Design an enzyme around this catalytic site. Structure first.
Site, PDB file in Angstrom:
ATOM      1  N   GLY A 244       0.811  -1.204   0.000  1.00 22.16           N
ATOM      2  CA  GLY A 244       0.000   0.000   0.000  1.00 22.16           C
ATOM      3  C   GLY A 244       0.846   1.256   0.000  1.00 22.16           C
ATOM      4  N   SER A 245       0.456   2.215   0.842  1.00 23.73           N
ATOM      5  CA  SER A 245       1.111   3.518   0.861  1.00 23.73           C
ATOM      6  C   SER A 245       2.498   3.485   1.488  1.00 23.73           C
ATOM      7  CB  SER A 245       0.236   4.528   1.606  1.00 23.73           C
ATOM      8  OG  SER A 245      -1.045   4.625   1.010  1.00 23.73           O
ATOM      9  N   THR A 246       2.899   2.370   2.101  1.00 26.66           N
ATOM     10  CA  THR A 246       4.205   2.305   2.749  1.00 26.66           C
ATOM     11  C   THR A 246       5.365   2.288   1.760  1.00 26.66           C
ATOM     12  OG1 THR A 246       4.059  -0.113   2.898  1.00 26.66           O
ATOM     13  CG2 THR A 246       3.276   1.166   4.782  1.00 26.66           C
ATOM     14  N   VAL A 247       5.111   2.055   0.469  1.00 24.10           N
ATOM     15  CA  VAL A 247       6.168   2.096  -0.537  1.00 24.10           C
ATOM     16  C   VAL A 247       6.137   3.371  -1.364  1.00 24.10           C
ATOM     17  CG1 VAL A 247       6.398  -0.400  -0.674  1.00 24.10           C
ATOM     18  CG2 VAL A 247       4.767   0.786  -2.154  1.00 24.10           C
ATOM     19  N   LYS A 248       5.223   4.293  -1.066  1.00 23.96           N
ATOM     20  CA  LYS A 248       5.286   5.624  -1.663  1.00 23.96           C
ATOM     21  C   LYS A 248       6.628   6.321  -1.461  1.00 23.96           C
ATOM     22  CE  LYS A 248       0.466   7.235  -2.031  1.00 23.96           C
ATOM     23  NZ  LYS A 248      -0.357   6.112  -1.503  1.00 23.96           N
TER      24      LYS A 248
END
EC number: 3.4.16.4
Length: 502
Positions: A244-248
């Site tokens: 999810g957003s943790t690899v943005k």
């Protein structure tokens, strides 16, 4: 009246310690009782006393000795206290013999069960470190000779053919003090949020060492009685999920390295959705228009990071993700370990370009995610993972340039400290940096990945809370408080100076 047979000499299994020498797996002398049924057949009037000494039913024990009357060896009971073994030996029952062997005892019990693993009844590693380093820990059994009667009576020793070579000591990278803290705090968070399971990983960003690795639910490796495979699941290394957003932050690292983006740049995300053919990119909160690059991370705007990804191309984002280890083999060699999947394309379409940029499609483990954030914390240098103590730090690979890595560090500190950010991840006295996320399996996984101190990072951490059933499933409400409490103790136990005191 004479027959020579080679008996094995058990090797002392190597001691497993934490990084500071605290015992984790200890070979303990045990007394195994065996019987020669041929000699027992000459002393039937002694069976009930021997049966009661072994906790066995009188008639059932008699049935067992009768059916094996032709054999020369059967197991009475395996792995007893030397006190217990000599108690049965003191009965002077003809045909009862004792064998001295070793059995593992795990002083930390359930706290480090998944990492250490366990051995079986034959002292062979079957899980965790016990299996991963089994050849190192097992040693080489020895060879002895003994004279056996034609009725099976042990007569005398003949000679020792080869001596046993004991196993070697192994010091893990785990800091048992951190392990106890992470185990307790992950357990408390599961009860407070009513979650089914969870994982917590702590890493030294400079050395690649896994300082702590705990999973809920867990099990006592000493009791071994009806352990359901759910509690034995090494989730931090086996569970895969969309990050999810943790690899943005890694999509951002590729953006800041393309030459086309700076943190002050603004992206229009109105009205919170973006249509790509029949696919509709959707933000969770859709109350924004223009956002800078930090605001894209704070709001977890999938639309914003998608437009950035369209501009720089997915290949630059894939390259950063592959080089930090996402969807790659960790080289840790643990049983049941899973690699996940980082998909690759010859020609990246618009849809796959976007979903890659905000963490859909690709699947990672908690260990991979922590390893990626460790590289970002280590000024862009990726050090290989290790579950054993690192004395000579291996050379890393500069995957993200130090300037870009330093810029993303500052942006992740703002995610934790700026208005509307993940303030529950703040560690008192320190500057923490991190990113929250959610992984849908209805059912979600609450994620938080970060590092500290933000200005001079030392520790990276990942928290995975599996299906909260009380408050909101969002990462930042459930996982961030665990990060704060555990990171605070990790920094204190390692004497990291506070960088956020007035």
């Amino acid at each position: 009246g004479g027959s020579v047979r080679h008996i094995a000499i058990p090797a002392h299994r190597g001691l497993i310690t934490d990084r500071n020498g605290e015992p984790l797996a200890v070979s303990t002398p045990v007394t195994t009782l065996w019987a020669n049924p041929k000699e027992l057949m000459t002393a039937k009037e002694r069976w009930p006393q021997l049966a009661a000494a072994l906790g066995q039913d009188t008639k059932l024990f008699a049935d067992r000795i009768e059916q094996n009357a032709e054999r020369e060896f059967i197991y009475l009971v395996r792995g007893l206290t030397p006190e217990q073994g000599e108690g049965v030996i003191a009965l002077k029952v003809p045909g009862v013999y004792s064998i001295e062997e070793f059995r593992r005892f795990y002083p930390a019990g359930e706290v480090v069960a998944h990492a250490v693993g366990f051995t079986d009844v034959d002292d062979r590693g079957r899980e965790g470190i016990e299996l991963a380093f089994d050849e190192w820990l097992a040693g080489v059994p020895g060879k002895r000779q003994v004279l056996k009667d034609r009725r099976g009576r042990v007569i005398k020793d003949v000679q020792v053919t080869k001596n046993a070579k004991p196993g070697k000591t192994l010091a893990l990278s785990i800091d048992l003090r951190l392990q106890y803290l992470a185990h307790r705090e992950l357990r408390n968070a599961l009860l407070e949020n009513g979650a089914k399971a969870g994982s917590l990983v702590i890493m030294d960003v400079k050395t690649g060492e896994i300082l702590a690795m705990t999973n809920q639910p867990t099990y006592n490796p000493n009791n071994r009685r009806n352990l359901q495979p759910a509690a034995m699941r090494n989730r931090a290394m086996i569970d895969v999920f969309e990050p999810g957003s943790t690899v943005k932050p890694f999509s951002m690292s590729a953006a800041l390295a393309s030459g086309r983006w700076k943190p002050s740049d603004i992206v229009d995300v109105y009205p919170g959705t973006l249509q790509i053919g029949r696919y509709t990119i959707r933000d969770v909160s859709r109350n924004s228009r223009q956002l800078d690059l930090t605001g894209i991370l704070i709001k977890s705007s999938n639309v914003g990071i998608s437009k950035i990804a369209f501009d720089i191309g997915a290949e630059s984002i894939y390259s950063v993700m592959q080089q930090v280890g996402l969807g790659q083999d960790t080289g840790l060699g643990f049983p049941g370990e899973r690699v996940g999947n980082l998909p690759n394309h010859r020609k990246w379409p618009k849809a796959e370009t976007a979903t890659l940029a905000y963490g859909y499609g690709l699947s990672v483990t908690a260990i991979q995610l922590a390893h990626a954030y460790a590289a970002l914390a280590n000024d862009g240098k990726s050090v290989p993972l290790s579950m054993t103590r690192v004395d000579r730090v291996p050379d890393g690979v500069q995957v993200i340039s130090p300037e870009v890595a330093s810029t993303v560090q500052g942006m992740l500190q703002q995610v934790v400290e700026a208005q509307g950010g993940v303030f529950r991840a703040q560690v008192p006295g320190y500057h923490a940096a991190g990113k929250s996320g959610t992984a849908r399996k209805n059912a979600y996984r609450s994620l938080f990945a970060g590092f500290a101190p933000a200005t001079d990072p030392r520790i990276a951490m990942v928290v995975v809370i599996d299906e909260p059933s009380k408050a909101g499933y969002f990462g930042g409400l459930v996982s961030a408080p665990v990060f704060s409490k555990v990171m605070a103790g990790a920094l204190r136990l390692m004497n990291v100076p506070p960088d956020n005191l007035p």
